Design a protein around this nucleic acid. Structure first.
Length: 90
DNA sequence: AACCCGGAAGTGAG
DNA sequence: TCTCACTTCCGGGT
């Protein structure tokens, strides 16, 4: 199961708002509220130990080059999706 | 600190 | 066996 899909799933469920949430969902900008908590949930999702935010965020950086995600410059823990799930699956 | 960066190479899963 | 999508490590930067 893919990082971008898992991120969209958490964003779609207000139960996870203490981990991650939309900042401006019209612009698809999201905030990682608890980067360590988020990495822990992701490692759990993939059934593997020793996942960290340093490691998860590296995986997010690969998405920059794939034009799936951009960092919001100078705004800590703020990112945006450049694509919808439909668009990513194309 | 706590986060952000992208190259290089390693690896679970299917 | 082979590919994919990360994972792991790194040396930096902010």
């Amino acid at each position: 199961r893919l990082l971008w899909d898992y991120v969209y799933q958490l964003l779609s469920d207000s139960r996870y708002e203490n981990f991650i949430r939309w900042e401006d969902k019209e612009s698809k900008i999201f905030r990682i509220v608890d980067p360590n908590g988020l990495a822990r949930l992701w490692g759990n999702h993939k059934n593997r130990t020793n996942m960290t935010y340093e490691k998860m965020s590296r995986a997010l950086r690969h998405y920059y080059k794939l034009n799936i995600i951009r960092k919001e410059p100078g705004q800590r823990l703020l990112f945006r999706f450049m694509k919808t799930p439909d668009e990513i699956m194309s």
